[PDB]
Amino acid sequence: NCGQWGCWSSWSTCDATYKRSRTRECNCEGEKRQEEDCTFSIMENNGQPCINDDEEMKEGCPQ
């Protein structure tokens, strides 16, 4: 069985703005704060969709 970073903190409540933060303690090299975005703009919930790789613009009586 033979400084180091500590454990991250709990994600703070999502503020009115996108800014949500998480902090790590050096209790060393690295970052002490990480600020990410959060808004939960997707209210609708239908199902997990499957996506393609790439698409194109363009492929009875006519028009």
Binding site: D15, A16, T17, F40, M43, E44, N45, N46
Partner: protein, 45 residues
């Protein structure tokens, strides 16, 4: 067509929870407008 009309979890997640008070309160107007237009309130108990 009657494809879909979906809106949920907005009233429970963000209803009441400095400069972003506008950003917070604006979507409530549109949610109320959608609820009045769709005429669907029986989804909740």
């Amino acid at each position: 067509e009657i494809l879909s009309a979906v809106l949920s979890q907005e009233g429970i997640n963000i209803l009441t929870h400095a400069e972003a008070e506008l950003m917070s309160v604006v979507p409530v107007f549109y949610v109320f407008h959608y609820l009045e237009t769709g005429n669907h309130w029986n989804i909740f108990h």
